[PDB]
Symmetry: C2
Subunit: 34 residues, 2 copies
């Protein structure tokens, strides 16, 4: 890091390219974490 | 409890009250803590 890794992760999840994450996208993050 | 659980996690992270998550907040999720 220095943000690069996270910026890419953000992007991968940020399917609808809005510079954000939403509820289903958050679902897709929180997937592994029960 | 599923669906509703996701809403809570979302909300815990979604400090700035936008119905989204941003990079720092994503930081707080991707905090495995560390
Ligand atoms: Ca998005
Ligand atoms: Ca937010």
């Amino acid at each position: 890091k220095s943000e690069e890794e996270l910026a890419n992760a953000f992007r991968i999840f940020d399917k609808n390219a809005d510079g954000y994450i939403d509820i289903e996208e958050l679902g897709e993050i929180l997937r592994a974490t029960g």
